[PDB]
Amino acid sequence: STPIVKASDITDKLKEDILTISKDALDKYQLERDIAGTVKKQLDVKYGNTWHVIVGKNFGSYVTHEKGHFVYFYIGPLAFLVFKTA
């Protein structure tokens, strides 16, 4: 399923990478925690520390992120909040 981007402060290349890593994450893992974990760890390695990932069907959030490192999107019913801090 093509991701539905709801909010973002991000460049195109970084966005496509996050979405790709997140789709692959869903095929690998069943638990939301593990899905978030593999996204977070891969981004830390590829783009530097420090990433944080929330994956879920019901949550509200308020966070602070580095400029150009924020995306919030759905893949099917599952929402992904992905962002980087210093």
Binding site: A7, F59, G60, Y62, K67
Partner: peptide, 11 residues
């Protein structure tokens, strides 16, 4: 440089 952001799932 940072920004703050709030989000809310639809379900």
């Amino acid at each position: 440089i940072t920004y703050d952001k709030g989000i809310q799932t639809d379900q």
